[PDB]
Amino acid sequence: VKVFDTKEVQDLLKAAANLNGDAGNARFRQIVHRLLSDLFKAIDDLDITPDEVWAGVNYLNKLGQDGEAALLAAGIGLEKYLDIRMDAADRAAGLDGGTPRTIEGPLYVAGAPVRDGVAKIDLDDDADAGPLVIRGTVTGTDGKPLAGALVECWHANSKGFYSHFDPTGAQTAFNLRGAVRTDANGKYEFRTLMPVGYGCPPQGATQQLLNGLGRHGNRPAHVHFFVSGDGHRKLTTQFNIEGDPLIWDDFAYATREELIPHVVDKTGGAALGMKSDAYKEIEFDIVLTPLLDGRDNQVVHRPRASAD
């Protein structure tokens, strides 16, 4: 049967969204009416059964009980889609030359201590991860180095786990998480260990949905960044570790070809405080976009974990 176009259904949608209500949050009512209307039409069009609907309702309970709604947002492409719309806006405005954005993901932790120029961020021993230096120069789109810019990174350990989100046991606070203010020449450096990519929690709601679609829930090895500086927009980006077999099969659709730097083998590690003489080095330079009339039209406010 098809009922969506009937007066009874359209009146129910108007009442459920309180479109005819006293002055209120008009924007919220507009969004709720649109999403509810679309859901009702999809149920009608695809003949979605009550059993199927209640299975979707039950899934929403599990999704939130697991705390995984933002992980699902990445896994079904919604987080990438937000980047697509931001990129389209920048393109229409004539912007080029900045380091490409990519997704934040759900695992930022606020409050990491800020160091000048260089930070050692591996606080916990990890025998299976080799030492890694990440270094680079931050500039603006005019090519000039940005001094005092804030470069933040976070990444996983050799088991694919992040501090504050490790199910096998608590890591030291801010393990593999750090913030550096660039030096006078725009330079930043992190001394860390090499990340390994991971999968979604195997019994969690995100992987349950992915299993139902026939999809894996894995990401290639990567390092996250936030980069900010006076006169410039905040950049959310990442880089992928070259050579990872999942680099073009990320379940969160986040890989970009300009964000895959070369990995160089180096010696002299002990004088840098690394745990072995031989280590890997990645040079990741970063270009920030200036503000427009003092405004950052793309910084994102969302719930984020914190720690002391």
Residues 79-108 that bind Fe ion (CB under 5 A): 105
| Residue selected from 10, 38, 124, 172 as contacting its own copies according to rule CB under 8 A | 38
Tell me: is residue 96 an annotated ligand-binding position.
Answer: yes
* Separation of CA 99 from chain center: 16
Should residue 96 be labelled a site residue for Ca ion when binding is judged by CB under 5 A? yes
At closest approach, how far in Å is the CB of 49 from its own copies? 9
At closest approach, how far in Å is the CB of 287 from Ca ion? 10
Helix (H) or strand (E) holding 242: none
> Judged by CB under 8 A, which stretch of 12-20, 148-156, 165-173, 196-204 contacts its own copies?
12-20
Residues 136-155 that bind Ca ion (CB under 5 A): none
Q: Which amino acid is at 190?
A: F
> Judged by CB under 6 A, which stretch of 103-111, 124-132, 166-174, 287-295 contacts ligand A1BA2?
103-111
Task: Identify the bridge partners of residue 281 per DSSP, sorted by sequence position.
Answer: 133, 264
DSSP state of 256: -
* Closer to ligand A1BA2 by Cβ: residue 106 or 229: 106
| Residue selected from 94, 271, 301, 308 as contacting its own copies according to rule CB under 8 A | 301
Should residue 125 be labelled a site residue for Ca ion when binding is judged by CB under 5 A? yes
Nearest residue to 164 via CA among 221, 109, 121: 109
Nearest residue to 171 via CA among 182, 185, 157: 157
Which three-class secondary structure state does DSSP give residue 228?
strand
Residue located via tokens 């927009």:
233
Partner whose footprint covers residue 107, from its own copies, Ca ion, ligand A1BA2, none (CB < 5 to 8 Å by kind): ligand A1BA2
Q: How many residues of this chain bind Fe ion (CB under 5 A)?
A: 1
Partner whose footprint covers residue 74, from Ca ion, ligand A1BA2, Fe ion, none (CB < 5 to 8 Å by kind): ligand A1BA2
- CB-neighbour burial class of residue 9 (10 A; exposed 0-12, middle 13-18, buried 19+): middle
Q: 119 with 190: CB under 8 angstroms? A: yes
Partner whose footprint covers residue 135, from Ca ion, Fe ion, its own copies, none (CB < 5 to 8 Å by kind): none
Q: What is the DSSP string of 48-109?
A: --HHHHHHHHHHHHHHHHTT-HHHHHHHTTHHHHHHHHHHHHHHHTT--SSPPP----S--E
Q: Which residues bind Ca ion (CB under 5 A)?
A: 96-97, 123, 125, 169, 273
What residues form the annotated binding site for Ca(2+)? 96, 123, 125
Residues of the shown chain interacting with ligand A1BA2 in the complex, contacts defined by CB under 6 A:
71, 74, 105-107, 200, 219, 252
